[PDB]
Design a protein around this nucleic acid. Structure first.
Length: 1240
RNA sequence: AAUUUCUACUCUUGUAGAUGUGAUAAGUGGAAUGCCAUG
DNA sequence: TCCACATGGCATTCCACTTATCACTAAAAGATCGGA
DNA sequence: TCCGATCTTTTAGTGATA
């Protein structure tokens, strides 16, 4: 018996708030005269310049370390193959433990505990490894022991510039700590070595082995192209794709040579490219041979390896040098232009072209690789000139035509034979386009260069000159200048004499593009330190001398106080907590023991003195300092904390590995009494009440006890401080005072406050002071950003500002992570079966469509959110897309989409949470592959497929309603928690709390009245005999005389090869070819019923736009075309199947394909709908154009509805199950069987 | 037509909703340019 | 499979864009600096 | 030239069933 309001305070969530600090008094003067802002700007610049040096040291240690790795890989290969062949759970855990073993084996080289290495280099690697995460990378001691990087004196001075400020690199350290770590982290060296690169190498090895086994005649070829690449010269082409060579494939250079072996060296522009592995695979594919088909059947693509983590990328391919500045590019192109007019190239080209217009053209030839380009630029189609020449060679003569077309691809043609093959329209089009191009070039040379390159117009005119010159170069590359044919030697020589100086314009074009499309520089905020090695890392009153960041509250306003260092020392300035009635600021007092799991052993067991006492003698030791009463450290407690093994005996890892529940329980009990009397005895924690703690033997584990213990030691009090002391503190410069500010703290604000402002007010409301549910955290950052009725546009960028970023944590009383959250949600859904279901369909046309269904599948509300607050976000986002791709092609600025997508997604998120709190329903969302959504966003990033999922998860993880009371469930004190804690999409399961991930196939293309899908696939129906065979499988066809319709009967025990093999429930189908007459909707608008939209096929494997069709009209036109009598209602199929002409059979398969076509779309006028081919058993032929609200209006509403009944299946399967866990998805066959059972 | 920041309006120098920051690393996808074969 | 309408394999720039980790700290301990 | 204050650094380690 649980409630909907019980889903609160499940787990901690961490957020960050941003504010603007307004200076108070003359403190803005005090930071200005002291010169801190420029000092932090130079410090950030120094850090940015020092980062390449320090990870140069990191890369040096890496490539010195993992070069010595030599391991077997057969166990991991067998584990991967076993898990891939049989996808069971225990095989998965075997794969994880093998991957962890190999990760530890790789990491031991960094650690220095590697078995195969001898002891001296082991201790050298260990003591060098001890220095990458301390101050040892700046004193040069690591540089002395590790290989001689030998940073120059400039970088030595740069390292001296960070003297006594190594804690600024502290966040860097935990960054690089993930590089050298083995706990399965995606930003680690051994995770990439084991889990990422090794399966790819195994795949390459296996596909190479089966490709050699299938066809070995290509075996020599790869060795040959290996001699083309000239790398791995001491290795065999079989040995490279063997497992042990992977012991070489760790350094960046070796994987670079592997990827370049797969790709091939690319030389400079103009010359050919050295072919590689995938190149020759594609070339063998494109032969249209039987060998091409068999290599097409197996996979025919080698996969490149991922880059190493911290290393840098090189190549053997040609790299084009980049233009350093805009002045250099405009100056160099001005000299290029002047040297080009000095060579009088334009009149030279005019001379050549009036020569080709006035001499015979049998002695001038055209290269065979440009016939398609000339055909596409000249005529409307690229296949015009090739087919014209092919038919002309036929007419001047089956097999002979094939050798003719084999000769056409590689033999160069003289241009008169093309003129005689084509028409004179080709000649005049050629002459006018040459006129157009040389007039463009003339305008290019006549027009002067722009003065600068800072704005768009100069960029676009320079682009215009460049592609005019380049198009002249392309037009120059049409002719076959080689003396292999009978080209005129003088004209060939002068065409080289123009083309060799037309060649560098292409490289100039690429250089200008590489300089031109750079992102324009923008002013960026940077971190302030205020000459302090640790700024605002904590709020504690002991560290308030060191961190120097405290807060004041003044009659509802909030202030940040910073204590600067006086004369380079820590001036311990304090205040007097006067009585409450005195006017003044209210200082917050912070009492925080950070985390007992790391403070307790550090402050009591992991000291130097206790260890020095305990190695030499075993007697227990009293500890006196920082204690009211000295605490006793016994032998067994230190053995529990330091057991010289990974499983600590109070940790449940020891209980899981061993099974001694009694000893683990007693060890846990003793450890809990030890931490109890330590918290009693310690100076900081002796004033904290600990009475809510249960007896020690009643505690299940360490994590639960820590979760209950943690929010007792977090405390905030408030003490009134005299105002005059604070004003003398700021006026003397001893205190930097700032005011936290946003939009809602202005005096003119009278509406509802922001959600972040609600969190900030809930932080300091006395209810949260009584019981801390939300918590102020440490590590608060300060940033400075330089500058970039009456209404001011972009007023916030007019002046330089100070910004404050502060982390908070909501649901602090709850545990850090939830336990069995999905079990709780399954329990609540099992106790509440009547809950609604919200189908969300994300699309590319209308984007987001919602449908609401009840427990019985009745529609409650359906909506397409193209227009929210009467604003068409879809159309605006589409035109933003159109101008983004237009600006990309025009070398303009590219902008961003994230802001507008975030605004529209915020509107739709508020809508769906409004309906969520109104209906207490669950949402259902289609499971989509990452590759599919990535390709969909690639063809059109108008779709929000992957972006909206993150916003839904983030909003449903921590949910606060602004209109709700604070103390009520859903307010800022008890926020709603309806989804699992977000970890990563890889470990995101099929169900995250109230959200479900349902399979994507077969949701849109389904009749909701009968559950009908198309059981055929039309790709298998290609030949005429296949069409006749499939026409044999139908039962019979009858012409209705009342309504003029056609009824075709079908049983799925026929046409099995032409069926897709998806057996539905209902064993009969009656396809209805309804008469194409005009019906009316609920609005009464006329519309012709049963019409279809079919793409217009141009020729074989060629399709254009789409055209409407009315299947009964052309069908009866077919029957009166052949003279078939059908008004008697006889069996039409045996009457028509005897006619063996292919045109007839093609017509009826076209009509039955069109009536079996479900999704009927027309984007030109924009009608999207479906028209069910099978009549409902109550005699209804469904069209969604009827606009009846009980059924979906359009096809995407239909898809969202079917996703909703898929979720209905999911919760029915939840109800009948007793394990309180969902099934691992559903299959298509069970889904369509279930919906056919429900419908009919 | 204003905002910690973003989106949408202008009745109030504002309104409605959203807003995990910093650091690091990798990957994806576009556009242009070439080399090579295909309809 | 869900989506379709000039291409496939690569190579080099440039751009946005996504995902995946880390902390979300006070005290212990060492380095340093001013005193006799 | 060696001690006592003090400022900077780094450090500590949990979660799953009777």
């Amino acid at each position: 018996m649980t409630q909907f309001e019980g889903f609160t305070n499940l787990y901690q969530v961490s957020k960050t708030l941003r504010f603007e600090l307004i200076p108070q008094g003359k403190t803005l003067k005090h930071i200005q005269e002291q010169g801190f802002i420029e000092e932090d700007k130079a410090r950030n610049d120094h850090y940015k310049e020092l980062k390449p040096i320090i990870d140069r040291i990191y890369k040096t240690y890496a490539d010195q370390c993992l070069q010595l790795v030599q391991l077997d890989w057969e166990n991991l290969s067998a584990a991967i193959d076993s898990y891939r062949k049989e996808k069971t759970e225990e095989t998965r855990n075997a794969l994880i433990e093998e991957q962890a073993t190999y990760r530890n084996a790789i990491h031991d080289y960094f650690i220095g505990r590697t078995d195969n290495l001898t002891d001296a280099i082991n201790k050298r690697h260990a003591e060098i490894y001890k220095g990458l995460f301390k101050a040892e990378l700046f004193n040069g001691k690591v540089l002395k022991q590790l290989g001689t990087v030998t940073t120059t004196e400039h970088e030595n001075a740069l390292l001296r510039s960070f003297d006594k400020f190594t804690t600024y690199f502290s966040g860097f350290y935990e960054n690089r700590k993930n590089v050298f770590s083995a706990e399965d982290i995606s930003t680690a060296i051994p995770h990439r070595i084991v889990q990422d690169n090794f399966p790819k190498f195994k795949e390459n090895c296996h596909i190479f082995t089966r490709l050699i086994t299938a066809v070995p005649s290509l075996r020599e070829h790869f060795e040959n192209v290996k001699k083309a690449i000239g790398i791995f010269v001491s290795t065999s082409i079989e040995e490279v794709f063997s497992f042990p060579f992977y012991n070489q494939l760790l350094t960046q250079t070796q994987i670079d040579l592997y990827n370049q072996l797969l790709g091939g060296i690319s030389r400079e522009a103009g010359t050919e490219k050295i072919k590689g592995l995938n190149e020759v695979l594609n070339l063998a594919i494109q032969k249209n041979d039987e060998t091409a088909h068999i290599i097409a059947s197996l996979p025919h693509r080698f996969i490149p390896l991922f880059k190493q983590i911290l290393s840098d990328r090189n190549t053997l391919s040609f790299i084009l040098e980049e233009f350093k500045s805009d002045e250099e590019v405009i100056q160099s192109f001005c000299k290029y232009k002047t040297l080009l007019r000095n060579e009088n190239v334009l009149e030279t080209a005019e001379a050549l072209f009036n020569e080709l217009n006035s001499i015979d053209l049998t002695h001038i030839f055209i290269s065979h690789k440009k016939l398609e380009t000339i055909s596409s630029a000249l005529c409307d189609h690229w296949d015009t000139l090739r087919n014209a020449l092919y038919e002309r060679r036929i007419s001047e003569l089956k097999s002979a035509k094939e050798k003719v077309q084999r000769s056409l691809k590689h033999e160069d043609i003289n241009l008169q034979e093309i003129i005689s093959a084509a028409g004179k329209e080709l000649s005049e089009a050629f002459k006018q386009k040459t006129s157009e191009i040389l007039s463009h070039a003339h305008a290019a040379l006549d027009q002067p260069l722009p003065t600068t390159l800072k704005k768009q117009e100069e960029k676009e005119i320079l682009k215009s000159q460049l592609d005019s010159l380049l198009g002249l170069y392309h037009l120059l590359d049409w002719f076959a200048v080689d003396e292999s044919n009978e080209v005129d030697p003088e004209f060939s020589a002068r065409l080289t004499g123009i083309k060799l100086e037309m060649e560098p314009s292409l490289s100039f074009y690429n250089k200008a593009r590489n300089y031109a499309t750079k992102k324009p520089y923008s002013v960026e905020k940077f971190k302030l330190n205020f000459q302090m090695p640790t700024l605002a890392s904590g709020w504690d009153v002991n560290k308030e001398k060191n961190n120097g960041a405290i807060l004041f509250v003044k009659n509802g306003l909030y202030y940040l106080g910073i204590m600067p260092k006086q004369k380079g020392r820590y001036k311990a300035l304090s205040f007097e907590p006067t009585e409450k009635t005195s006017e003044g600021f209210d200082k917050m007092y912070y009492d925080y023991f950070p985390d007992a799991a790391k403070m307790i052993p550090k402050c009591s067991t992991q000291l130097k003195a206790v260890t020095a006492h305990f190695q030499t003698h075993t007697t227990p030791i009293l500890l006196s300092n920082n204690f009211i009463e000295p605490l006793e450290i016994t032998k067994e407690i230190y053995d529990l904390n330091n057991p010289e093994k990974e499983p600590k005996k109070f940790q449940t890892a020891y209980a899981k590995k061993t099974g001694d529940q009694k000893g683990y329980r007693e060890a846990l009990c003793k450890w809990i009494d030890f931490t109890r009397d330590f918290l009693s005895k310690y100076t900081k924690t002796t004033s904290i009440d600990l009475s809510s703690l249960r007896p020690s033997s009643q505690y299940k584990d360490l994590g639960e006890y820590y979760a209950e213990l943690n929010p007792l030691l977090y405390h905030i009090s408030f003490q009134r401080i005299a105002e005059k002391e604070i004003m003398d503190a700021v006026e003397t410069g001893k205190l930097y005072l700032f005011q936290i500010y946003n939009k809602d703290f202005a005096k003119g604000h009278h509406g509802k406050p922001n959600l972040h402002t609600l969190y900030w007010t809930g932080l300091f409301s006395p209810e949260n002071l009584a019981k801390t549910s939300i918590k102020l955290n440490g590590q608060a950052e300060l940033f400075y950003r330089p500058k970039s009725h009456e209404i001011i546009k972009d007023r916030r960028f007019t002046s330089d500002k100070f910004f404050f970023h502060v982390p908070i944590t909501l649901n602090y009383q709850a545990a850090n992570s939830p336990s069995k959250f999905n079990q709780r949600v399954n329990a609540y859904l099992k106790e509440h079966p009547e809950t609604p279901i919200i189908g969300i369909d994300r699309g590319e046309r209308n984007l987001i469509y919602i449908t609401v269904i009840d427990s019985t599948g009745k529609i409650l509300e359906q909506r397409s959110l193209n227009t929210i607050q009467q604003f068409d976000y879809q159309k605006k986002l589409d035109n933003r897309e159109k101008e983004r791709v237009a600006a990309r092609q025009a070398w303009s600025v590219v902008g961003t989409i994230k802001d507008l997508k975030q605004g529209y997604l915020s509107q739709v998120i508020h809508e769906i949470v409004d309906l969520m709190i109104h209906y207490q329903a669950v949402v259902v969302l289609e499971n989509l592959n990452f590759g599919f959504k990535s390709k969909r966003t690639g063809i059109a990033e108008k779709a929000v497929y992957q972006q909206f999922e993150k916003m839904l998860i983030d909003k449903l993880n921590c949910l606060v309603l602004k209109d709700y009371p604070a103390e009520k469930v859903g307010g800022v004190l008890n926020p709603y928690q309806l989804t699992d804690q977000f970890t990563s999409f890889a470990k995101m399961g099929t169900q995250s709390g109230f959200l479900f991930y349902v399979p994507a196939p077969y949701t849109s293309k389904i009749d909701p009245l009968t559950g009908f899908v198309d059981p055929f696939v039309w790709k298998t129906i290609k030949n005429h005999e296949s069409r006749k065979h499939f026409l044999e499988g139908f039962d019979f066809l009858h012409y209705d005389v009342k309504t003029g319709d056609f009824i075709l009967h079908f049983k799925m025990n026929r046409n099995l090869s032409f069926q897709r093999g998806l057996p539905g429930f209902m064993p009969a189908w009656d396809i209805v070819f309804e008469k194409n007459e005009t019906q009316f909707d609920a609005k009464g608008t006329p519309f012709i019923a049963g019409k279809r939209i079919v793409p217009v096929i141009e020729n074989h494997r060629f399709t254009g736009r789409y055209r409407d069709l009315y299947p009964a009209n052309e069908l009866i036109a077919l029957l009166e075309e052949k003279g078939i009598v059908f008004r008697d209602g006889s069996n039409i199929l045996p009457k028509l199947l005897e006619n063996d002409d292919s045109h007839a059979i093609d017509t009826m398969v076209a009509l039955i394909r069109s009536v079996l076509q479900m999704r009927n779309s027309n984007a030109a006028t924009g009608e999207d709908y479906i028209n069910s081919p099978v009549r409902d058993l109550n005699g209804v032929c469904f069209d969604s154009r009827f606009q009846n609200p009980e059924w979906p209006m359009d096809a995407d509403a239909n898809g969202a509805y079917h996703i909703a009944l898929k979720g209905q299946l999911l919760l029915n399967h939840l109800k009948e199950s007793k394990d309180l866990k969902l099934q691992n998805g559903i299959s298509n066959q069970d889904w369509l069987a279930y919906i056919q059972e429900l419908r009919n």
